[PDB]
């Protein structure tokens, strides 16, 4: 098994999967990890017995979806590959707002407050957690204003958004 942390790439107290080489810390891992198999062997074992679910879906229809157990673990996994990026640092905790010329969000909204919210099963369709983590974006981009830091908020949802179509198969377009 690897010697660092598969979501954050530090060394330290690690759980290894006995299904693939990969390695977490406990709250690395996402659910908390808990012989033991990882999301990334649970994602791909969904994928296994059901190849139809790698055919192309409608983003729409997908975000109807009811939370039932395979929805959110891709749900879990999705917030776990956007941890999985260093700039997820700036998204996961608690923001606060204090900048001459901008006014902070209505609705703040941050990972791990996702994860919790996730944790408790508080969403009940994939469409109230892709809602709240594109919020974090957006609140982003709209305080920062012409800031140059607001290119943090593009490059983290062009990671959230690159797996959200991978992993619920959104059908390619042009
Ligand atoms: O962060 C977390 N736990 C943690 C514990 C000890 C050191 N660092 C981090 C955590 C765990 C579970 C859930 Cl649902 C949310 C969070 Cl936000
Ligand atoms: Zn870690
Ligand atoms: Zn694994």
Redesign the pocket.
Known sequence: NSNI?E??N?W?RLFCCDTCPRS??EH?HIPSVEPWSCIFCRIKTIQERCPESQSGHQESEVLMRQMLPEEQLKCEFLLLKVYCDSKSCFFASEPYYNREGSQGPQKPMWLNKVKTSLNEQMYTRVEGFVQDMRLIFHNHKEFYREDKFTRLGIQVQDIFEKNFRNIFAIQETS
């Open positions: 942390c979501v954050c530090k330290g977490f810390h690395c």
